[PDB]
Design a protein around this ligand. Structure first.
Ligand SMILES: Cc1c(C(=O)NS(=O)(=O)N(C)C)cc(-c2ccc(Cl)c(Oc3ccccn3)c2)c2cc[nH]c12
Ligand SMILES: Nc1ncnc2c1ncn2[C@@H]1O[C@H](COP(=O)(O)OP(=O)(O)O)[C@@H](O)[C@H]1O
Ligand SMILES: O=C(O)[C@@H]1CCCC[C@H]1C(=O)O
Ligand SMILES: [Mg+2]
Ligand SMILES: [Mg+2]
Length: 262
């Protein structure tokens, strides 16, 4: 049982859809953590209060060094608070802005961590569905940590999400409003692997219009510097038909992953 009086609030770590994430310290233990704050009014208007308990319940029951931890949760008159593990090295998103693109070693490494964390999520039939650089956080040793379980659900699901932010990571099945499996996360893995190497996602467009078309048609191209091995893994992953998409063990054992991964 927790309350806001139990914490000292620091600076904002980042901005959320329904609030903001703050750096904080628990007074009793001196424990540093991140407090994800969600406004009740905003959540009510979206009718997503049910999905919040779902994000809460799913994340709370996951233990993995490559998965952001959820210590607890509490609420008051106006807000719902999520006591998260603090990731000191920020988002993968911020890293990509800095470096423009990652090398094959860095990419394969992040992909390995994603795949481990993902395979483990899928073992509980848990699908993330919001895999993207802003939701991939970095630990003290620079280890990839999956976060933002806001749109997570148990597999299979037919649930429709509050439209995009960027439609860029969603598979055609989710976009078409069709039923989806753990395959959604595999598609996202292909999008992420491409973005890390190229600096931008494979179906990126100026409009939601063009993006939907491109995702639907699976219409993307590789720049010349992309290695043949990277092309194979990405190509294997971006299958329109979910069944075609490989398992995580195949991904984890891919020669390119094994050659440049750590
Ligand atoms: C209006 C309201 C309440 C609320 O007032 N609850 S209560 O006081 O009346 N009533 C006793 C459950 C509660 C929530 C809510 C929705 C989801 C979560 Cl996870 C939440 O946080 C916790 C944490 C620990 C135990 C239970 N819930 C709170 C939301 C989300 C949007 N509007 C809300
Ligand atoms: N544990 C954390 N450590 C560090 N930064 C965090 C942490 N959790 C969130 N952030 C920052 O706050 C942003 C929003 O948090 P997130 O859980 O992804 O919210 P939302 O569901 O609103 O998108 C993140 O993308 C990141 O920039
Ligand atoms: O944690 C949140 O801000 C939200 C809870 C309700 C579902 C959507 C979710 C999100 O945008 O990640
Ligand atoms: Mg997010
Ligand atoms: Mg979210």
């Amino acid at each position: 049982q927790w309350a806001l009086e139990d914490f000292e609030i620091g600076r904002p770590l980042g901005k959320g859809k329904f609030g903001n994430v703050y750096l904080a310290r628990e007074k009793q233990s001196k424990f540093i953590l991140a407090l994800k704050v969600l406004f009740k009014a905003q959540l009510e208007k979206a009718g997503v209060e049910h999905q919040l308990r779902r994000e809460v319940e799913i994340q709370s029951h996951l233990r993995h060094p490559n998965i952001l931890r959820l210590y607890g949760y509490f609420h008051d008159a106006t807000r719902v608070y999520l006591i998260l593990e603090y990731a000191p090295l920020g988002t993968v998103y911020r890293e990509l802005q800095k470096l423009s693109k990652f090398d094959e070693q860095r990419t394969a490494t992040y992909i390995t961590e994603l795949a481990n964390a993902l395979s483990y999520c899928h073992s509980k039939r848990v699908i993330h569905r919001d895999i993207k650089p802003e939701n991939l956080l970095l630990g003290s040793a620079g280890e990839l940590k999956i976060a933002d379980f806001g749109w997570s659900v148990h597999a299979p699901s037919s649930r429709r999400t509050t439209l995009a932010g960027t439609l860029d990571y969603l598979p055609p099945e989710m976009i078409e409003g069709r039923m989806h499996d753990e395959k959604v996360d595999l598609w996202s893995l292909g999008v992420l692997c491409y973005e890390f190497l190229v600096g931008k996602p494979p179906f990126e467009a100026n409009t939601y219009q063009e993006t939907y078309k491109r995702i639907s048609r699976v219409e993307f191209t590789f720049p010349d510097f992309v290695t043949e091995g990277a092309r194979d893994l990405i190509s294997r992953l971006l299958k329109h038909n979910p069944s075609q998409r490989p398992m995580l063990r195949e991904v984890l054992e891919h020669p390119w992953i094994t050659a440049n991964s750590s």
